[PDB]
Amino acid sequence: YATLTIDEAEKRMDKKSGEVPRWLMKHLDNIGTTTTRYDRTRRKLKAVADQ
Partner 1 sequence: TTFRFCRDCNNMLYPREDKENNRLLFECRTCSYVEEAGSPLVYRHELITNIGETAGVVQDIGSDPTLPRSDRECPKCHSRENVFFQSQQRRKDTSMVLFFVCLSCSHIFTSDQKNK
Partner 2 sequence: DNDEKLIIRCRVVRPKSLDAETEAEEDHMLKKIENTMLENITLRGVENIERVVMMK
CA dihedral 16, 35, 32, 12 (to 10 degrees): 0
Q: How far apart are CA 47 and CA 45, in angstroms?
A: 5
Taking the complex as a whole, how short is the minimal distance between the CB of residue 27 and partner 1, in angstroms? 12
**Which residues between 5 and 44 bind partner 1 (CB under 8 A)?**
22-23, 25-26
* 21 makes contact with partner 2 (CB under 8 A): yes
Q: In this chain, which of 3, 15, 16, 23 binds partner 2, going by CB under 8 A?
A: 23
**Residue numbers at the binding site for partner 2 (CB under 8 A):** 19, 21-23
